[PDB]
Amino acid sequence: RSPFESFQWKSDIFNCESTDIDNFYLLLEQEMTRLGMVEKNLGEVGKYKVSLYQSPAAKSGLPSLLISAGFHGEESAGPWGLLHFLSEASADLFERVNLSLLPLVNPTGFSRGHRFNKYGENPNRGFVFENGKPKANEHTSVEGKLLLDHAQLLIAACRDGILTCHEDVLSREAYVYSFEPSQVPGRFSLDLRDTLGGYFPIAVDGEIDACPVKDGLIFNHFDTSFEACLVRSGARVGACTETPALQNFDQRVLANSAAMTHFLALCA
Numbered sequence: 001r002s003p004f005e006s007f008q009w010k011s012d013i014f015n016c017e018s019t020d021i022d023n024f025y026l027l028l029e030q031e032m033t034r035l036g037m038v039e040k041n042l043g044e045v046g047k048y049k050v051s052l053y054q055s056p057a058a059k060s061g062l063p064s065l066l067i068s069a070g071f072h073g074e075e076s077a078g079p080w081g082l083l084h085f086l087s088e089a090s091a092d093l094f095e096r097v098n099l100s101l102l103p104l105v106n107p108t109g110f111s112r113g114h115r116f117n118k119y120g121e122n123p124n125r126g127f128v129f130e131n132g133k134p135k136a137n138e139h140t141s142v143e144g145k146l147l148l149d150h151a152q153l154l155i156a157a158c159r160d161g162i163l164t165c166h167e168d169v170l171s172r173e174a175y176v177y178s179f180e181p182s183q184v185p186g187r188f189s190l191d192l193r194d195t196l197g198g199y200f201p202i203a204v205d206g207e208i209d210a211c212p213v214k215d216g217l218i219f220n221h222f223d224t225s226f227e228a229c230l231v232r233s234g235a236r237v238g239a240c241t242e243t244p245a246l247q248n249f250d251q252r253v254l255a256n257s258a259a260m261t262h263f264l265a266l267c268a
């Protein structure tokens with residue numbers, strides 16, 4: 001499917017269109033302000049800021065975990081899923097974890113309902129790991145460059161876990177890419193897979209790219225994506241969940257919220 005094809009859904013959970021970025025930010029601000037989270041602006045893309053939000057007064061006894069969403073503008077259940085999750089959270093959460101968020105990496109694609117940003121770039125690629133260091137290549141987008149410029153901040157934010165919430169518009173079946181320092185998947189991988197399995201049928205088999213999925217899982221597959229790069233940079237575990245964008249939008253929002261919840265429980 002074309003990376004400029006526009007996808008839009010109605011959510012009765014939020015009573016709005018999935019591309020309603022103005023409403024998205026209004027609720028995001030309210031939830032961030034209620035939680036006491038600190039904004040760290042990384043830069044701008046087409047008039048929108050791309051910001052990292054962080055829980056205040058991080059403690060070294062707690063794990064530092066990063067949840068990111070909205071690298072691809074048509075995968076809007078990720079960002080709205082994050083809003084859902086936050087609406088159900090209290091500042092008490094920050095006693096269990098040092099949470100950092102990238103709630104919407106690709107705002108220009110998100111307001112248009114399409115995968116690429118409005119400049120025809122793919123914000124989720126071009127993160128190469130060379131000479132023991134994260135680096136850009138010719139595919140790194142404006143957003144990726146902003147993320148790479150803050151590589152040290154982001155590695156620190158996700159040393160104990162990186163979850164990125166994606167969606168697959170070509171799929172009716174859920175699946176998850178995971179990274180664990182093991183030849184075989186463990187509870188981390190299997191629990192996320194099962195959480196999605198509670199909302200959707202699972203990608204029992206096939207291949208996404210040259211990558212085989214078995215029982216909803218793609219394990220330790222390294223590419224030039226933000227997640228793989230951060231895991232190579234030192235993120236102890238990583239997961240990129242894929243909810244199926246051919247299913248009901250609010251189910252995806254709830255699935256994305258459940259996965260974030262489970263991710264935090266598994267890593268805390």
Ligand SMILES: [Zn+2]
Binds near residue numbers: 071072075124167
């Ligand atoms: Zn994606």
